[PDB]
């Protein structure tokens, strides 16, 4: 199910070429859950994302 969630903290540039951004995300519908995600594109604090599969939390070193 489509679930929407807001960016609180961008954790940094990840990926081999720096193509992705690791970011800290909290949900609006339940503003208690917190997840870590990888995004493509320019992200600043306050961006709200639409997640198709909001179960797994992404990871890169």
């Amino acid at each position: 199910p489509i679930k929407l969630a807001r960016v609180t903290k961008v954790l940094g540039r990840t990926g081999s070429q720096g193509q992705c951004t690791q970011v800290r995300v909290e949900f609006m519908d339940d503003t208690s859950r917190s997840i870590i995600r990888n995004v493509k594109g320019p992200v600043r604090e306050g961006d709200v994302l639409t997640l198709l599969e909001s179960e797994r939390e992404a990871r890169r070193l």
């Binding site: 961008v10 954790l11 940094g12 540039r13 990840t14 690791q22 990871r59 890169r60 070193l61």
Partner: peptide
């Protein structure tokens, strides 16, 4: 510490890098 090495090994370095790129009268 071991906790610091594990957390810093599973996180990403962020911040420091500077790129030098690029009236009245």
């Amino acid at each position: 510490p071991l906790a610091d090495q594990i957390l810093a090994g599973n996180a990403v370095r962020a911040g420091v890098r500077e790129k030098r790129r690029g009236e009245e009268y």
